[PDB]
Design an enzyme around this catalytic site. Structure first.
Site, PDB file in Angstrom:
ATOM      1  N   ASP A  23      -4.221  -8.048   4.729  1.00  0.00           N
ATOM      2  CA  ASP A  23      -2.744  -8.357   5.295  1.00  0.00           C
ATOM      3  C   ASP A  23      -2.330  -9.886   5.818  1.00  0.00           C
ATOM      4  O   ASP A  23      -2.703 -10.130   6.918  1.00  0.00           O
ATOM      5  CB  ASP A  23      -2.584  -7.398   6.753  1.00  0.00           C
ATOM      6  CG  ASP A  23      -1.550  -6.982   7.115  1.00  0.00           C
ATOM      7  OD1 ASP A  23      -0.327  -7.782   7.404  1.00  0.00           O
ATOM      8  OD2 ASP A  23      -0.895  -5.915   7.478  1.00  0.00           O
ATOM      9  N   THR A  24      -1.655 -10.431   4.968  1.00  0.00           N
ATOM     10  CA  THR A  24      -1.380 -11.806   5.192  1.00  0.00           C
ATOM     11  C   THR A  24      -0.279 -12.006   6.431  1.00  0.00           C
ATOM     12  O   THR A  24      -0.302 -13.017   6.889  1.00  0.00           O
ATOM     13  CB  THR A  24      -0.716 -12.292   4.005  1.00  0.00           C
ATOM     14  OG1 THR A  24       0.568 -11.584   3.671  1.00  0.00           O
ATOM     15  CG2 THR A  24      -1.689 -12.299   2.803  1.00  0.00           C
ATOM     16  N   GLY A  25       0.410 -11.056   6.722  1.00  0.00           N
ATOM     17  CA  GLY A  25       1.221 -11.150   7.977  1.00  0.00           C
ATOM     18  C   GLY A  25       0.614 -10.766   9.228  1.00  0.00           C
ATOM     19  O   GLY A  25       1.028 -10.866  10.366  1.00  0.00           O
TER      20      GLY A  25
HETATM   21  O1  LIG Z   1      -1.000 -10.650  14.585  1.00  0.00           O
HETATM   22  C1  LIG Z   1      -0.061  -9.793  15.004  1.00  0.00           C
HETATM   23  C2  LIG Z   1      -0.732  -8.083  14.559  1.00  0.00           C
HETATM   24  C3  LIG Z   1      -1.880  -7.917  13.951  1.00  0.00           C
HETATM   25  C4  LIG Z   1      -2.217  -6.728  13.355  1.00  0.00           C
HETATM   26  C5  LIG Z   1      -1.190  -5.808  13.685  1.00  0.00           C
HETATM   27 CL1  LIG Z   1      -1.704  -4.031  13.401  1.00  0.00          CL
HETATM   28  C6  LIG Z   1      -0.148  -6.017  14.605  1.00  0.00           C
HETATM   29  C7  LIG Z   1       0.109  -7.082  14.785  1.00  0.00           C
HETATM   30  C8  LIG Z   1      -0.197  -9.471  16.465  1.00  0.00           C
HETATM   31  C9  LIG Z   1       0.401 -10.978  16.897  1.00  0.00           C
HETATM   32  N1  LIG Z   1       1.672 -11.421  16.177  1.00  0.00           N
HETATM   33  C10 LIG Z   1       1.911 -12.707  16.732  1.00  0.00           C
HETATM   34  C11 LIG Z   1       3.277 -13.253  16.305  1.00  0.00           C
HETATM   35  C12 LIG Z   1       4.495 -12.645  16.798  1.00  0.00           C
HETATM   36  C13 LIG Z   1       5.799 -13.255  16.962  1.00  0.00           C
HETATM   37  C14 LIG Z   1       5.930 -14.088  15.500  1.00  0.00           C
HETATM   38  C15 LIG Z   1       5.804 -13.213  14.183  1.00  0.00           C
HETATM   39  C16 LIG Z   1       5.983 -13.685  13.155  1.00  0.00           C
HETATM   40  C17 LIG Z   1       6.058 -15.077  13.000  1.00  0.00           C
HETATM   41  F1  LIG Z   1       6.187 -15.559  11.977  1.00  0.00           F
HETATM   42  C18 LIG Z   1       6.158 -15.879  14.234  1.00  0.00           C
HETATM   43  C19 LIG Z   1       6.016 -15.469  15.607  1.00  0.00           C
HETATM   44  S1  LIG Z   1       7.217 -11.949  16.666  1.00  0.00           S
HETATM   45  C20 LIG Z   1       8.321 -12.463  17.999  1.00  0.00           C
HETATM   46  C21 LIG Z   1       7.719 -13.628  18.860  1.00  0.00           C
HETATM   47  S2  LIG Z   1       5.820 -14.213  18.431  1.00  0.00           S
HETATM   48  C22 LIG Z   1       1.824 -11.265  14.731  1.00  0.00           C
HETATM   49  C23 LIG Z   1       1.191  -9.945  14.446  1.00  0.00           C
HETATM   50  O1  LIG Z   2       1.800  -7.355   9.370  1.00  0.00           O
HETATM   51  C1  LIG Z   2       2.525  -6.709  10.603  1.00  0.00           C
HETATM   52  C2  LIG Z   2       3.205  -7.508  11.479  1.00  0.00           C
HETATM   53  C3  LIG Z   2       3.313  -8.915  11.264  1.00  0.00           C
HETATM   54  C4  LIG Z   2       4.122  -9.678  12.372  1.00  0.00           C
HETATM   55  C5  LIG Z   2       4.728  -9.027  13.336  1.00  0.00           C
HETATM   56 CL1  LIG Z   2       5.580  -9.994  14.577  1.00  0.00          CL
HETATM   57  C6  LIG Z   2       4.709  -7.537  13.492  1.00  0.00           C
HETATM   58  C7  LIG Z   2       3.798  -6.850  12.439  1.00  0.00           C
HETATM   59  C8  LIG Z   2       3.269  -5.654   9.777  1.00  0.00           C
HETATM   60  C9  LIG Z   2       2.316  -4.478   9.045  1.00  0.00           C
HETATM   61  N1  LIG Z   2       1.469  -3.849   9.677  1.00  0.00           N
HETATM   62  C10 LIG Z   2       0.704  -2.981   9.273  1.00  0.00           C
HETATM   63  C11 LIG Z   2       1.173  -2.047   8.597  1.00  0.00           C
HETATM   64  C12 LIG Z   2       0.291  -0.832   7.696  1.00  0.00           C
HETATM   65  C13 LIG Z   2       0.902   0.731   7.510  1.00  0.00           C
HETATM   66  C14 LIG Z   2       2.320   0.239   6.806  1.00  0.00           C
HETATM   67  C15 LIG Z   2       2.581  -0.743   5.992  1.00  0.00           C
HETATM   68  C16 LIG Z   2       3.882  -0.900   5.458  1.00  0.00           C
HETATM   69  C17 LIG Z   2       4.914  -0.420   6.094  1.00  0.00           C
HETATM   70  F1  LIG Z   2       6.209  -0.853   5.945  1.00  0.00           F
HETATM   71  C18 LIG Z   2       4.452   0.557   7.244  1.00  0.00           C
HETATM   72  C19 LIG Z   2       3.447   0.979   7.624  1.00  0.00           C
HETATM   73  S1  LIG Z   2      -0.150   1.273   6.081  1.00  0.00           S
HETATM   74  C20 LIG Z   2      -0.275   3.023   6.780  1.00  0.00           C
HETATM   75  C21 LIG Z   2       0.387   2.817   7.874  1.00  0.00           C
HETATM   76  S2  LIG Z   2       1.006   1.382   8.875  1.00  0.00           S
HETATM   77  C22 LIG Z   2       0.519  -4.901  10.435  1.00  0.00           C
HETATM   78  C23 LIG Z   2       1.192  -5.853  11.188  1.00  0.00           C
END
Ligand SMILES: OC1(c2ccc(Cl)cc2)CCN(CCCC2(c3ccc(F)cc3)SCCS2)CC1
Ligand SMILES: OC1(c2ccc(Cl)cc2)CCN(CCCC2(c3ccc(F)cc3)SCCS2)CC1
Ligand SMILES: [Cl-]
Ligand SMILES: [Cl-]
EC number: 3.4.23.16
Lengths: 99, 99
Positions: free
Chosen positions: B25-27
């Site tokens: 998961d790159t996000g």
């Molecule tokens: O790693 C996370 C995470 C890891 C795993 C799982 Cl399951 C869920 C979340 C938990 C922390 N957020 C921190 C950044 C949140 C905000 C933000 C998002 C994207 C961006 F490009 C810049 C800022 S979004 C609005 C303000 S900072 C990312 C996903």
């Molecule tokens: O990167 C995220 C994130 C990054 C940044 C921020 Cl600010 C917030 C979230 C967004 C995705 N989730 C993982 C969800 C995995 C499952 C899923 C996949 C795709 C989908 F569309 C719905 C569910 S796979 C099976 C159930 S969840 C982690 C944090």
């Protein structure tokens, strides 16, 4: 390009002649964008993520340019914390993970 | 290897001697794993995803092996249906996005 992951893979996309920053996210199946108005008929859809379910509007066949690469596909719009490009459009621009 | 995104990028990981599957998961900044019992001291954290926040427990310096690659870093354990490998461990195995 090659994007390393010591920084978030945030990229400028253009949609509806709007420029936005969006995260390249291999863990998301769908592309979901922050509320905005796009022309077109939309289906209501509920999608689940880790904190719970959100309600989104589904738009199909939307043209989106991601870092100079054109894609045409479904965009879900709704209360996501950030604009997320998921696998439905990452596959279209030829994106792979490598190690 | 090179991983295309036609399907979810689930890979095999080993923690302790547990064989688990996990989403690349790159996000995600952080690695969040399903509820398990790990060695050492932990502190609670709230992390928000799509849908809201979940409470997780933070463990530092946990060795995780992901497709035969060794990584050591912080792992958050909480109620997730999927193990998610985030950028903190993805850089350690030299993983990149390419298009
Ligand atoms: O790693 C996370 C995470 C890891 C795993 C799982 Cl399951 C869920 C979340 C938990 C922390 N957020 C921190 C950044 C949140 C905000 C933000 C998002 C994207 C961006 F490009 C810049 C800022 S979004 C609005 C303000 S900072 C990312 C996903
Ligand atoms: O990167 C995220 C994130 C990054 C940044 C921020 Cl600010 C917030 C979230 C967004 C995705 N989730 C993982 C969800 C995995 C499952 C899923 C996949 C795709 C989908 F569309 C719905 C569910 S796979 C099976 C159930 S969840 C982690 C944090
Ligand atoms: Cl999520
Ligand atoms: Cl977040």
């Amino acid at each position: 390009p090659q994007i390393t992951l010591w920084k978030r893979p945030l990229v400028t996309i253009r949609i509806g002649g709007q420029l936005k920053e969006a995260l390249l996210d291999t863990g998301a199946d769908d592309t979901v964008l922050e509320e905005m108005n796009l022309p077109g008929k939309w289906k209501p859809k509920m999608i689940g993520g880790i904190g719970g379910f959100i309600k989104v509007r589904q738009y199909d066949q939307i043209p989106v340019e991601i870092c100079g690469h054109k894609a045409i596909g479904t965009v879900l719009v709704g209360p996501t914390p950030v604009n997320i490009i998921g696998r439905n459009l990452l596959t279209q621009i030829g994106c792979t993970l490598n190690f």
